[PDB]
Amino acid sequence: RNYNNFNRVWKAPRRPFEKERLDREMKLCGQYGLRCKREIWRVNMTLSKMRRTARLLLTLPENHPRRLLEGSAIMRRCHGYGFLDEDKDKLDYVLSLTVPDILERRLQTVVFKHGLAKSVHHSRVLIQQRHIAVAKQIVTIPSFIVRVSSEHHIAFADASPFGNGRPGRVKRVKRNAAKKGSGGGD
Amino acid sequence: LYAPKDWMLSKLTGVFAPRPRAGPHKLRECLSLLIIIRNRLKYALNALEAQMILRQGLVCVDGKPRKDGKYPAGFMDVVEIPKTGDRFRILYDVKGRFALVRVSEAESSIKMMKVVNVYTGTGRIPVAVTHDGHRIRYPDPRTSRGDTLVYDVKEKKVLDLIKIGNGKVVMVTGGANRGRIGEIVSIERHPGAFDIARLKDASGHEFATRATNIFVIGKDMSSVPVTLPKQQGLRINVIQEREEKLI
Amino acid sequence: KAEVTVRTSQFKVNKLLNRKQFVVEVNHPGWCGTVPAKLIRNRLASLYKVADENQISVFGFKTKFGGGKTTGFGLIYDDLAAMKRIEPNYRKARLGMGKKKLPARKSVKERRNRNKKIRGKAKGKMQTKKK
RNA sequence: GAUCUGGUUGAUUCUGCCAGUAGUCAUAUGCUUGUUUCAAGGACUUAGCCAUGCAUGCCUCAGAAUCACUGCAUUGCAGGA
RNA sequence: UUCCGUGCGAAAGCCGAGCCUUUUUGCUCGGCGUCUACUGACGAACAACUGCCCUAUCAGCCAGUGAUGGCCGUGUAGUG
RNA sequence: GAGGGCAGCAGGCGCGCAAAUUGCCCAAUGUCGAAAAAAUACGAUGAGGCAGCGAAAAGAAAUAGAGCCGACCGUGCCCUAGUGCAUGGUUGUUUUCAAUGGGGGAUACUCAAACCCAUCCAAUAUCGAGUAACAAUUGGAGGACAAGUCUGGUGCCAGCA
């Protein structure tokens, strides 16, 4: 009969009450002002996975393909994206890496870093009640990661009251003017 | 499923696709027409438009303009679609993949077919059978399987068969080296493993795949006046391709 | 009070079908007094400088969350005949130009459950489980 | 994550097994659910039993008046019982 | 030497057209139908080498015939 | 006399620890059939597809911002320290203007159909948050394994493990 390739992805992290484990993780989480450990898990996974890949890749008998392919790929996006660096180019940092490197490239945080917003939190919430363009949508999903030219893009929803030649019944909450016109209305 | 992967079908749907038909150019080495109507030329897009082709019959193929979409198209077939009058030939490009390859009407006025078998016919008659659906009476007196043969298509006319051997311009049609092209370097008899085939590609990089999957197509590049897939079948450095790509 | 406009982009010509397929980039905010349906279509007619303003098929939206948003895909018909043959009647209806067969969720699908064994007679409305 | 830890002594160093521990996105169930995106879903026990309801047909221009019927003033392609 | 499927080889059905004929009958031309044998696909049947899971207080098993093989024919779509 | 056979599909019951609808539709997909005079639109489809049912699962997520006062701790120094000032971080019934989606609606705009959002224009959309709201669970607090120093209960009981 017949199918679909859906699947199930990501993995949680082993064995709880390890004071340090809890501590370290938290601190990081503290920097970003978070909404779940799940977000960490997610990063660990990914982190790991490439880190895994890393583990594999280097040992590859030198002069053989993958290392070239994937190395370039990984290099160029991560590096591209504003993650990896030019000097993180012998794949040796790639073996290394840090979770923060990643967090740091949560686009939200980069923003706040970028300036914009008063914190990464302030940054979450903004983006989220629909604000600042880069893509098709503001960033509806501050969950995202960066990619180096979005970097530039980061600005208004001109769309938003926040960049409108007009505003809207919200945030600013024009509305009141509607209330005025209906209520106040002579 | 049993989807045939070099038909480049995909993702969701198509349990079967429209299944092909019994009738020359075998199940696995076909590239049947339907897929073309909808998925290649693209005008006709639904099944509804296909259906429409058919309820208003339309579509047309050299030889018989052909009625059957389920009828295999395969190496070298010549389509003309008179609404716009467009012709394509069936042929692999490198990296193994099949195109519908637009071809000159005049080039699209002949084809070449390998002999699969060479027989008597009833009465010092001989008849040859080609690896793609021809039986032809009274051929060369000494033709043989694995020699291809030029056909008029417009007419019923053999234009050739070419007294085969080693060192002849080949298009590798399968095994690993599908879409590889290489002049024959040679075949060693390997009897009952079949000859195995030393191939060298346009680089002059040489490669092997078994002798069975070998379509002589000429001498001096193409003897044939048929379309030659860009690159002409080495298979190389992907990487660079990626690189190349990114301007 | 405009404000509001329909940009198009990535457009392709299909000769054989006697019809044309293509992209739409749309904003609105201020204009109004505006708009219903017809114009959406007209613009694409007259974007491609085709007059028959009902020789137009439009589709190219559905939506979900992903807010406000307005990118379609559009089509342009050579003739009303070409349309009358390319467009199915619920679509045609979506324009307005005819209906397809009577539905009734296999109401008389039942005759079909009767018919292969049975010859002649019958004589219209002959009938089984439905008492 | 290429660790375990918890549990026999008067201590002590020990062989050593249980307890926990990590998954299984495997089944059931309990509890408890903001959106919302992406979702398999009466195999398993008895291939137990089954009302029910519903689940093979179709013609073109291209095999067949039949005076039914229908069509249209009528013809009448057609249609067609 | 021989035959209870071919002697498709046309006493049947479209659309299209010619010319006669008024047109029709006739006479033409054109594209399709009913239509047998051989091939191909297509597929199905049939078969080995190789490979498979528990278990000896399971070891011998195995030969009325079919067990193993050998003989003529059967018998089958054919092999046996 | 006659006559039945859902390990289709939905339905039923049944069993049992145990598993959703007598829903839409016939687009696409396939698939079959005849093969759109479509000159009369027009096969056929519990396959399939759409929904319905469906917290097994995978995607992403909500209680918002900020300031003022209170107040706080935490530094630098005045100063003894301190008030203070200064140097910082942070609480709150205060205080508050200020944040602001859910969430639902002009809806143009979907979908076979039905359906799951809505540009936020136009009375240039109305509307919608600071709260018990427009909402937090679940399970622990000797140890392993995070987390009581004990408020109160309790009394080898209840019960816990």
Q: Please give the single-letter amino acid code of residue C52.
A: D
| DSSP result, B24-74 | SS-GGG---THHHIIIII-S--SHHHHHHHHHT----BSSS--S-TTS---
CA A31 from centre of chain: 14
Environment class of residue C99 by beta-carbon count within 10 Å: exposed (0-12), middle (13-18) or buried (19+)?
exposed
B48 touches chain C (CB under 8 A): yes
Question: Are β-strands B125-130 and B135-137 bridged in parallel, bridged antiparallel, or unpaired?
Answer: antiparallel
Given a contact cutoff of 8 angstroms between Cβ atoms, the answer to whether A41 and A13 are in contact is yes
**Running DSSP on this structure, what letter comes out for residue A101?**
H
Cα–Cα nearest to B88, from B46, B149, B31: B31
Sign of CA dihedral C109, C113, C114, C119: positive
Among chain C residues, the shortest Cα distance to B55 is held by C85
- C25 sits in which H/E element: strand C19-27
Residue with tokens 């298979």: B235
Distance from CA of C16 to the nearest CA of B (A): 6
C14 touches chain B (CB under 8 A): yes
Given a contact cutoff of 8 angstroms between Cβ atoms, the answer to whether A157 and A136 are in contact is no
The Cβ of residue B169 has, within 10 Å, a number of other Cβ atoms equal to 20
Query: What method was applied to determine this entry?
Result: cryo-EM
Residue with tokens 């085969």: B164
* Nearest-angstrom CA–CA distance, C4 and B244: 41
For every residue of B112-176, which 3-state class applies, written as one string?
Answer: ECCEEEEEEECCCEEEEEECCCCEEECCCCCCCCCCCEEECCCCCCEEEECCCCCCCEEEECCCC
Residues after which a C–N gap over 2.5 Å breaks chain A = none
Q: For chain B, what is the largest distance between any 2 Cα atoms, rounded to a whole number of angstroms?
A: 66
Q: Please give the single-letter amino acid code of residue A91.
A: L
Angle formed at CA B13 by CA B11 and CA B19, multiple of 5 degrees: 110
* Nearest-angstrom CA–CA distance, B179 and B232: 8
Let me know how long chain B is: 247
From the CA atom positions of chain B, what is the Rg in Å?
19
Distance from CA of B102 to the nearest CA of A (A): 34
* Nearest-angstrom CA–CA distance, C102 and C68: 37
The CA-to-CA distance between both ends of chain C, in Å, stands at: 63
The Cβ of residue C86 has, within 10 Å, a number of other Cβ atoms equal to 21
B126 CA → F146 C1’, Å: 91
| DSSP result, A156-176 | --SSSGGG-SS--SSTT-TTH
Q: Per the CB < 8 Å rule, is B239 touching A2?
A: no
Cα–Cα nearest to C83, from C123, C41, C114, C117: C41
CA B171 from centre of chain: 10
**Structure-token pair, residue C57:** 């098929």
Given a contact cutoff of 8 angstroms between Cβ atoms, the answer to whether A94 and A56 are in contact is no
Q: Please give the single-letter amino acid code of residue B210.
A: R
Contacts of C32 in chain A (CB under 8 A): none
Q: Which residue spans within A83-127 are E strands per DSSP?
A: none
* Nearest-angstrom CA–CA distance, C13 and C75: 9
**Structure-token pair, residue B52:** 């429409």
The CA-to-CA distance between both ends of chain B, in Å, stands at: 39
Contacts of residue A54, defined as CB under 8 A and 6 or more positions apart, other chains included, come to: A91, A94, A95
Angle formed at CA B189 by CA B183 and CA B192, multiple of 5 degrees: 120
Distance from CA of A183 to the nearest CA of B (A): 56
**Structure-token pair, residue A67:** 């290392």
**Structure-token pair, residue B76:** 């070298």
Given a contact cutoff of 8 angstroms between Cβ atoms, the answer to whether B80 and B86 are in contact is yes
Given a contact cutoff of 8 angstroms between Cβ atoms, the answer to whether B177 and B183 are in contact is no
Residues after which a C–N gap over 2.5 Å breaks chain C = none
* Nearest-angstrom CA–CA distance, C20 and C57: 10
* Nearest-angstrom CA–CA distance, A2 and A135: 37
Contacts of residue C37, defined as CB under 8 A and 6 or more positions apart, other chains included, come to: none
Q: Please give the single-letter amino acid code of residue A175.
A: R
CA dihedral A22, A27, A28, A34 (to 10 degrees): 90
- Which strands, in side-by-side order, build the sheet including B206-210? B206-210, B196-200, B180-188, B169-172, B214-218
- Which strands, in side-by-side order, build the sheet including B135-137? B115-121, B125-130, B135-137
C124 CA → D79 C1’, Å: 15
Cα–Cα nearest to B226, from B94, B90, B129: B90
Protein residues closer than 7 Å by CB to strand D? A 4, 6, 8, 10-12, 14-16, 18, 48; B 57; C 64-65, 106, 109-110, 112-113, 115-116, 122-124, 129-130
* Nearest-angstrom CA–CA distance, C49 and C40: 14
Q: Per the CB < 8 Å rule, is A69 touching B12?
A: no
* Nearest-angstrom CA–CA distance, C29 and C35: 11
CB pairs under 8 A between A and C: 11
Q: Nearest 5°: phi and psi at B166? A: -20, 145
Q: Per the CB < 8 Å rule, is A140 touching C30?
A: no
**Structure-token pair, residue B136:** 């032809």
* Nearest-angstrom CA–CA distance, C47 and C20: 12
- Side-chain half-sphere of A160: how many Cα atoms within 13 Å? 20
Q: Where on strand F do bases come within 7 A of a protein Cβ?
A: 23-32, 34-38, 41-42, 44-46, 48, 57-66, 99-101, 107-113, 115-129, 145-147
Contacts of A128 in chain C (CB under 8 A): none
Given C29, C67, C68, which is nearest A166 (Cβ)? C29
* Nearest-angstrom CA–CA distance, B99 and B226: 14
CA A97 vs CA A64, A104, B70, C55, C82: distances in Å: 24, 12, 55, 59, 61
Q: Which nucleotide in the DNA or RNA is closest to residue B116, CA to C1'?
A: E40
Given A2, A4, A68, which is nearest B239 (Cβ)? A68
Q: What resolution, expressed in A, was reported for this entry?
A: 5.6
Cα–Cα nearest to B53, from B35, B26, B72: B35
CA A65 vs CA A70, A180, B115, B215, B240: distances in Å: 9, 70, 40, 31, 12
* Nearest-angstrom CA–CA distance, A154 and A131: 10
**Structure-token pair, residue C4:** 């509001």
**Structure-token pair, residue B71:** 């009828």
Q: Per the CB < 8 Å rule, is A166 touching C67?
A: no
Cα–Cα nearest to C77, from C93, C43, C54: C54
* Nearest-angstrom CA–CA distance, B113 and B151: 8
Residue with tokens 């978070």: A34
Q: Nearest 5°: phi and psi at C26? A: -115, 110
| Three-class DSSP category at B213 | helix
Q: For chain C, what is the largest distance between any 2 Cα atoms, rounded to a whole number of angstroms?
A: 71
Cα–Cα nearest to B176, from B32, B1, B30, B6: B6
**Structure-token pair, residue A27:** 């601190």
Residue with tokens 């009828």: B71
